[PDB]
Amino acid sequence: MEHVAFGSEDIENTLAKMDDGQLDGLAFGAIQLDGDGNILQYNAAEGDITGRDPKQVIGKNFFKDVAPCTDSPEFYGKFKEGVASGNLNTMFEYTFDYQMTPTKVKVHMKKALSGDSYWVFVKRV
Numbered sequence: 307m308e309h310v311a312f313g314s315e316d317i318e319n320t321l322a323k324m325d326d327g328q329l330d331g332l333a334f335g336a337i338q339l340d341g342d343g344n345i346l347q348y349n350a351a352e353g354d355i356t357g358r359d360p361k362q363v364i365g366k367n368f369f370k371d372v373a374p375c376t377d378s379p380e381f382y383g384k385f386k387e388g389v390a391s392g393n394l395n396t397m398f399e400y401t402f403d404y405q406m407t408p409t410k411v412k413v414h415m416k417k418a419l420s421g422d423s424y425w426v427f428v429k430r431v
């Protein structure tokens with residue numbers, strides 16, 4: 307497995323070297339979102355929670371079509387503020403209920419080492 311703990315401070319440095327496959331060995335959900343909310347990466351872990359297909363939701367809008375349940379001031383609002391601000395590192399509990407059993411999860415959002423890329427790590431709680 308890809309040994310890298312959830313919530314690690316230097317996670318974007320460690321993760322900035324993993325291809326898709328490399329990214330599928332993680333013990334938690336990982337999503338790469340561009341500046342507009344377009345899915346750049348989607349690993350198998352999150353798929354296992356949301357039931358979506360990693361290869362299927364690539365290139366689609368996450369807040370608009372993939373995960374509308376995150377279209378709120380509590381998810382989206384924080385994201386845009388971060389996008390616009392140029393930075394963001396925030397941890398929070400949340401519930402994904404769209405097209406699925408309500409699953410009490412925890413979300414960690416942080417800007418990547420790259421320019422306009424943002425990470426959205428998720429785990430069961």
Ligand SMILES: *C(=O)/C=C\c1ccc(O)cc1
Pocket residue numbers: 352356358372373374375376401402403404405
């Ligand atoms: C709220 O988040 C509902 C559904 C959902 C859809 C896609 C992904 O990746 C997570 C959760």
